[PDB]
Symmetry: D2
Subunit: 465 residues, 4 copies
Amino acid sequence: MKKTKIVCTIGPKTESEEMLAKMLDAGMNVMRLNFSHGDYAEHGQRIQNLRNVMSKTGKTAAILLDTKGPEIRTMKLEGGNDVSLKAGQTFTFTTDKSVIGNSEMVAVTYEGFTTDLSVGNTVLVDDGLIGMEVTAIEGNKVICKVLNNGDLGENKGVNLPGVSIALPALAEKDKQDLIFGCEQGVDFVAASFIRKRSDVIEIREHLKAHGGENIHIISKIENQEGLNNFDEILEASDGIMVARGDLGVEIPVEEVIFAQKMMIEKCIRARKVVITATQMLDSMIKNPRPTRAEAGDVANTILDGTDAVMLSGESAKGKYPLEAVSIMATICERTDRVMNSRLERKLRITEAVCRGAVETAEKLDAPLIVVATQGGKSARAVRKYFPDATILALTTNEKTAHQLVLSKGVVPQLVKEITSTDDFYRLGKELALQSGLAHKGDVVVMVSGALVPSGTTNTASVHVL
Amino acid sequence: MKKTKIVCTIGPKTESEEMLAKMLDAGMNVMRLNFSHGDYAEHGQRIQNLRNVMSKTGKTAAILLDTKGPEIRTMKLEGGNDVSLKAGQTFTFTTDKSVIGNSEMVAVTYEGFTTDLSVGNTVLVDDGLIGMEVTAIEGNKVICKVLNNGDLGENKGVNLPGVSIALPALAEKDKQDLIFGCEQGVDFVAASFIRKRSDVIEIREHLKAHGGENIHIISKIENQEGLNNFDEILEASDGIMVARGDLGVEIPVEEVIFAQKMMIEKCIRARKVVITATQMLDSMIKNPRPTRAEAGDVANTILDGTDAVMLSGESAKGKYPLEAVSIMATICERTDRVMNSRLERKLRITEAVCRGAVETAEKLDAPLIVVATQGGKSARAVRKYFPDATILALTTNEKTAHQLVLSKGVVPQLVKEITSTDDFYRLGKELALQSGLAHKGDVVVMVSGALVPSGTTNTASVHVL
Amino acid sequence: MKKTKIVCTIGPKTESEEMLAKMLDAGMNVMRLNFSHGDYAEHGQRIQNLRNVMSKTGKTAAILLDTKGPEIRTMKLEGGNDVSLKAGQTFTFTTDKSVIGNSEMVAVTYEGFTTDLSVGNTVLVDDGLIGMEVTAIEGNKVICKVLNNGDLGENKGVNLPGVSIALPALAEKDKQDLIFGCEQGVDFVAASFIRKRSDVIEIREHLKAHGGENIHIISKIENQEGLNNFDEILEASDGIMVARGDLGVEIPVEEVIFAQKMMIEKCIRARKVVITATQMLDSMIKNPRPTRAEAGDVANTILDGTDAVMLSGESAKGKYPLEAVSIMATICERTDRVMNSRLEFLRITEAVCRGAVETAEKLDAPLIVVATQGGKSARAVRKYFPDATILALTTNEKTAHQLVLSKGVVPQLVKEITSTDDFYRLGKELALQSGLAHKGDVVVMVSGALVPSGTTNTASVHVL
Amino acid sequence: MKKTKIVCTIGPKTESEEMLAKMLDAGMNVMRLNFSHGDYAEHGQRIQNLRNVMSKTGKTAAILLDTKGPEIRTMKLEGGNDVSLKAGQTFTFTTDKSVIGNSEMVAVTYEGFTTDLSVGNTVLVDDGLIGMEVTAIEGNKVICKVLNNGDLGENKGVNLPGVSIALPALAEKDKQDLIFGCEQGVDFVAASFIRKRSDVIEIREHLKAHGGENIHIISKIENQEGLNNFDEILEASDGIMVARGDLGVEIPVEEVIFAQKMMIEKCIRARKVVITATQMLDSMIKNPRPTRAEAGDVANTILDGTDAVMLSGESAKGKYPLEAVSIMATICERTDRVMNSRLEFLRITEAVCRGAVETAEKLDAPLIVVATQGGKSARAVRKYFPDATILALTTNEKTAHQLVLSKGVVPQLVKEITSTDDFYRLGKELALQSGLAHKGDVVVMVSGALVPSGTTNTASVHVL
């Protein structure tokens, strides 16, 4: 069975219980709610439909709330009509939100546009369609020279490569969306356009104020500032979402692949979950099969070591959502099965024990590593070494059981209680057999914390089923 | 400087001496002549233009002749008009080349179509646009059920996934093209649609009969039969071209990435040159920049270990040929510079010596490995270990000097003579300094064959410049 | 502190409670009783003297009893006087124990001497001092040609290389010593002249018939036959005594050092205890300090990997027993401290124990705490020569004493161990009480959880 | 064949051409002349006898000459009779060489005895048999308290641990021996009681003044001062003689074995030859075979990594010189054959030579052929203890003889080597001629190409 986890964006085509059950069967592990669209009633029934399928089937899944985030956009044009911009012309942005645009000027939504930009900077409009160079900044105007021909429509995204943008961490609507996330008890929040550590702290504080302190934060890295501050962002976050498409608009194209590989490797080492996202199987919005190129990108992303891969429009609104999940699962299984363990700063007890446990499992052809865990840390510490064995993670914590669904190669199981180390061994052997993942005579390695506070893994034990 | 080599398909936009000089400056190493197009006079002046630039500038390059190859194609339709085929309809192919086609039947160019196919096989038409299933074979007819809607035009390619096709190794025109290659003294022949070892032998025999015995054969692997017979094809060939696009039409999509990775690794181990080709920077036929996806695929292909990457329409006919070469070179340099040596069957002398030479170079921070070579074997034997050092390959053989241009990280240099091992050391130290790749005080490792027949590398020597 | 253990043969000068306490202070770990001097009352009192010292001082020690093997000896000579034998003369052995010997013939203690020997066999007398070749066998006489000049004394050992001697492993004459050992509850029996596995089984069956099934058998390898059969002897034994001096009588001199090294290595791999003995510090029977040569041999024996070194006359009969123990301990400490772990290992026990040593090394753990019933887990950890001391907790009193012989093990008898978590609690306590580790130190704790005795499957890392 | 080299001290029983040829046959590689017996005519004839055997038989050997060092000795006693000294008595040393000694006072050979000593220093007599403490110094007298009972004989060595003796490295009395060595063209000088690097330089300057600049200096480490200064002594020397018996007089007994092991290891790393000497097979001065203990010490010395082992009285004065050489060679062969390469190495020479050994091992090469002028490249390959024999081709006759001392090296003098390719041609020929390799075998060939002597930079693999 595959080890890499699949995040599916769920939308109108895929939100029914019937469709969700088929998506789970096909390999979906996590539902993404994209809050760039839909209202609270719609997202609420989506959440309930998934939870209904879970309780009826006993299948497990996690729920991830992806925020819209703050943004810079252009605004309206005369008559609603596109205008044609020409290489070499002068073009001006104004922060006066009342201005209606034309072929010479358009308003932007961001009051700080003049402050943050500098003469010589690049302005990109509409997913990089039209590039411009700032030639002067005067009052509420950023005056530019257009670099290539293109048609400007209304309400288009603006990207400022290499610029530290003083947008707030959270749009006002994002703040209400997070409260909804707390009300609904989602498992993860993916926070958009994270640029610096203080952005993460603000999200953490907002969740804490509404009872969401146990919701894990996945920071979306989308531009050069976020990459520059990656280490501090990761330290403050519970995980990372690699937004390849945004990066390709914002940094030199030849760097994007190494930004992805670096972020995945650092997440692995930090024992934090990483999702790779955008431009995965986009061709399947319209087509029943992906391209060779897309399949190869997915496979290489898995070989890079990602915990999870994410479907966007393909699973939410496209014509072939089940086919997209299925072929994604096929690629995952085919790629996961040729990956090997990775068995490589003063040494901490948890890492010594977990690395040794994986080494022992490999030396003894153990099909399963059973881990006792409260918050998920010990399960993620074992996964760091990419064990051949499946990780059966026993927890009494319902939130942890859902969150571990996102971690590569982990099968979480909720248990009523674990009263002692020896009880853990007895129970874990029972559930190992019940799971069908191991059989009489198989070796299992069992990892837990004994006589220590939650958050430290210190014991490894070898049992025959 | 980059180590990965760039093959550029040269066409009308890029065949002038002026453009070729700029392509070389931008990182082109090898000219591909695609003999699916153009006549002998055109290819001849292309060859002469490159050779003129080489002699005027002293720059070096190789010339590769890519054959059209045999193929199965559909033929003509009533009035020259496209026909619309519908999912579920019956559709029939006939091997009667006189038949004019319609929405129910079309002729194919291949007399063996009925013989090679079986009930239940898949027929794909026009680069996989329209898929069909064989339901019966009767006389000169292959009767099918169409699997998806699509428009059939005239003269479209046909692919038969998983089928061993009895086309000859060489189309009649290919046979005359190879004679032209011998007349012109090209450095490489890339042979299309290689399915089995006997295909390679036929090409080898045709070249030998026209004085081309020193022309190296790169076999193009395009379908499942060729993959099945890969080991014997590689053994008989001088190198491999991985044709990703053809593979994506012919084998399960999730296997294509591993077919590429496997073929590259086996070529490396065999000390034979590998080119990765098709669907590289195709978006730059129309656009001045590539996509994120394309750049990531190129980088991962280099990380896989390919000797060379190939541009097709982007460099031959597209709008931005110089831009395509430049960004390709940028990706190569950025990716090459983060790759490490790979310092891993009874042991042969050549491999023991060459591996040890690379290990010694690495231990001593040597910027250059100087190799004496007649046919190129010792240079390729060192390159197998992906040395950090540049390989300066001294040869008296003009063909070898050109052929080594395709090998990763090799700088060939033609020398008048090498009379002894000690003379090799004196000359190699001189040319090391002349090359600008090493300076006084640098260590160089010098590899050669002493008192042995050509084809064996047995000596490694460490010198300070 | 040293890790190599010291076995001291106890004799007249050293059997008092006062002298035994000083020997323990100086580094003695195991008392050997050689059952060729004194009667059972003497031996019983020696045992009691040690046990009094142990209970008074709280110090721990083991008791090793030597059981006699199938040896052949020559007997008495005219007037008690040595005689000179010359190369080429005829010399005759007789099995008539009433004959008093001279320069032409001597008696031997073994009635089967004529039966077991054949024309052409070699007879060696007095640890190979005098070699002879059998030329004829007639009646009760074995007639020989002397091969080299030498002086024959009284009551000398006889070696028959290449001859399988038909005596049993344990003669009825010598079985009472083993029954006495069972009655006294000794920890080890060291069986002399073990030749083959069936000898070991014979001793094992004798012990099991007298309540001694938990007594460990150390097989003494002293002659070529035993060396030839070493692998099967080790498999059947609990441990080995390398008696290099005796072994050297029958095999080529250049082979003896490698016989020692090979036997120690196989014992280590088998997780079975090995004692190296004979010609250790013999010069200290008469002198207050050893020779350079002796100290170097001892050190190299430790570097070979021996669990224990043994003093014989130096501690039993000599003039400087305390000095011998002290310098031996000094050599042990100086050599032990430059030895490193050997971290090459599959079985679960070996995987867990090897990994536990690796983890201890990576985390600078001063101590590995092991729960053990029969001692196997402690010996399984010791196989990798950990830098850390092994604190071995057991409820089994026999095990606690036997582990005293194992390199680098500190045994501790505990009342009970009720669960894995209880073991971690108790072990942290005793680690601190022992003074072998302090607050903040890492200890690695090794045990069997939900498995029968004999399998070690759990390793756990704790901060004191 | 063995790889460890044997140095034999040659004396009266062994100096004839007949006996020397037999010693070479039995495994002798180097003749040591101890310049304390006989006059120059005797020594010259011994040298000539060996060189006659060499030219007649084509066999090769080296000649090592011992130069005398700053030793102190006691002198004569009344009637030649031993005297008994008792713990606690007063005993007096005098620098008056005319005094004949008794139980109260003896003369010493050294006039500076009173100057160099201080109240409280320890004086050791006769290899530490009798220890004393200085209580006063008055006039020409050093007055002491005897620390232990012992019998004083005539002409005994004196050791002053912790005192730097003010004698020069080479007294004018002892410089003629070194000039004689230069005249005779010996291969090595072994300098006694080297204490510090300036002693080595003093010997080097003396040799350079008499045409002996190409003679190699082996520094003998015999006392605590030399051990303390070992690193600088080795740097200045061409090699080391570990004289464990003498060294053991002044340092703690448990340290001597590690002093030997450490010195051998440092010599190996420095690519400098090391001889282990004293108390090797001394029992064979009187007996036709050695002891187990002696054979084991020799074997462990070889396993430590020594280039050579040395016989002293066993080959010079004893009754069984040929038997001593033979059993030594047997021990060498038996121990050498179980030793493995040590493939840890940056400098170009070390990279190339270590890699050449690795390549030879990977390709099962029986031979590494080295071109060498001064011997450095051959010694650089030997550092890694290759399984392959080292065939060392040189045009330098002194080098050819000196390499005889290096472990596992077969030197061969050749007329000339004109190029790297010529070396490969000649080396393949001589490999086949030598019988050390056969057609089809792989040989690895190591040399310097386009560099000055002293740098090895080329490794080449050939099939014979």
